[PDB]
Design a protein around this nucleic acid. Structure first.
Ligand SMILES: [Mg+2]
Ligand SMILES: [Mg+2]
Ligand SMILES: [Mg+2]
Length: 430
DNA sequence: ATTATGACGCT
DNA sequence: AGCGTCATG
């Protein structure tokens, strides 16, 4: 009754750039704009591997993780942009720098959590309180929500998409109680007004379009963001959760798209996230552990407490390269050359990070994969990172991994290495 | 021979 | 610490 908390205490948004690497390339090269186009890494093997796809190209069935030659079978007119190559490897600096552009704009509106290169969570609770104080009880005009969908509406007693969007928005705004400054639905609505403004600012100042979700917590905001892409935002109210979850496959919720979600489905014999409500918190903890069980019990009712962390910068700076099939590194000279290439990219990025952000990394993590290991990482080992010097870092990494060489010969490396990864971690202020 | 990242949990 | 899981541009 009155004591069951409803998880409506915060307003949280998730902003996600649409097809981000494609947009970065389309800004640079106007010939790619409003075209089926994709971004690829490398070229020789099957035309390169696609990592980002414009919505025009998605209409033909082009997806990430598809080889460009195969995508061209689906979409003969597909345009491609290649990721930069430096020191023999893909270099993602252009997209990291574009990400910083966007994150700095978002940070003007609220403190953000950088969830990935192209997405950030926003805690809007305080900004919403402020805007409500300025509103003085004035209703919210639909004109202030020109790209907002209200999930679950319209409902009840036109055949165009924008018409449906506006009917739903109208139903939502008509049912709104604008004099209660503590109404969660009103708070979400003002949150959506702010996110319209943030998305307008991102597009004006960068050229980049994004989608967003507005709800009461991170998981619902992420889910909402995905409901209407691209270039749109979606409000998921607490009240919309029972219907939304009643047909929502468990794998769609962040953290349940892998083994844990599969085990929820198999152990409980259910398919949809709403079906979780029929289990006690202790039942879910018995199957999935204390933490997961409590999380699932609350999440299937729309409630989640994970805070938006005040963190706009990545916690690690890493450099990785796979050496698949026949390109696996089989000589010590080879291993040392590539460790050096990775370490030189790492040094460049670290020195820039130190100048920009007033911090220094203090641990170097070295990870490798050996031929025939099913796992993505075969071995992970840390050592001290005391100097931003590529030759030192690569010599230290070699010292850390050199006992992996099974070869009786010092010149040969066996089993050959199919992946090298250098990562700088544990930053301290400087 | 989907690749290059990045965050976080477990023990 | 080192390993596994989840996300996926
Ligand atoms: Mg995106
Ligand atoms: Mg994203
Ligand atoms: Mg994506």
């Amino acid at each position: 009754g009155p004591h069951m908390a409803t998880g409506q205490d915060r307003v949280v948004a998730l902003v996600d750039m649409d097809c981000f690497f494609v947009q970065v390339e389309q800004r640079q090269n106007p010939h790619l704009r409003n075209k089926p186009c994709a971004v690829v890494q490398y070229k020789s093997w099957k035309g390169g591997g696609i990592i980002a796809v414009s919505y025009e190209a998605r209409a033909f069935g082009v997806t990430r993780s598809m080889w460009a030659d195969d995508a061209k079978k689906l979409c003969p007119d597909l345009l491609l942009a290649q990721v930069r190559e430096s020191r023999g490897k893909a270099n993602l600096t252009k997209y990291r720098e574009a990400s910083v552009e966007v994150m700095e704009i978002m940070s003007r509106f609220a403190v953000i959590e950088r969830a990935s290169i192209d997405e950030a969570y926003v805690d809007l609770t305080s900004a919403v309180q402020e805007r409500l104080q300025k509103l003085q009880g004035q209703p919210i005009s639909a004109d202030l929500l020109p790209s907002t969908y209200i999930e679950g509406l319209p409902q009840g007693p036109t055949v165009q998409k924008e018409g449906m969007r506006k009917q739903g928005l109208f139903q939502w705004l008509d049912s709104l109680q604008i004099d209660n400054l503590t109404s969660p639905d009103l708070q979400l609505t003002v949150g959506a007004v702010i996110v319209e403004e943030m998305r307008a600012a991102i597009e004006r100042e960068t050229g980049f379009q994004c989608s967003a979700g507005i709800s009461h917590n991170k998981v619902l905001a992420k889910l909402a963001c995905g409901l209407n892409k691209p270039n749109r935002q979606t409000l998921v109210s607490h009240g919309s959760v029972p219907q939304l979850f009643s047909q929502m496959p468990i794998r769609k919720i962040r953290s349940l798209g892998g083994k844990l979600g599969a085990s929820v489905i198999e152990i409980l014999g259910i398919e949809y996230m709403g079906e979780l409500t029929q289990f006690t918190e202790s039942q879910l903890q018995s199957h999935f552990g204390e933490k997961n069980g409590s999380w699932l019990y609350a999440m299937c009712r729309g409630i989640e407490h994970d805070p938006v962390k005040p963190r706009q910068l990545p916690k690690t700076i890493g450099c990785s390269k796979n050496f698949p099939g026949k390109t696996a590194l089989a000589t010590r000279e080879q291993v040392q050359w590539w460790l050096l290439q990775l370490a030189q990219e790492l040094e460049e990025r670290l020195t820039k990070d130190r100048n920009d952000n007033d911090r220094v990394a203090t641990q170097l993590v070295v990870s490798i994969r050996v031929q025939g290991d099913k796992r993505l990482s075969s071995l992970r080992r840390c050592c001290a990172l005391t100097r931003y010097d590529a030759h030192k870092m690569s010599h230290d990494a070699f010292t850390v991994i050199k006992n992996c060489n099974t070869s009786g010969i010092q010149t040969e490396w066996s089993p050959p290495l199919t992946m090298l990864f250098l990562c700088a971690t544990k930053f301290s202020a400087s």
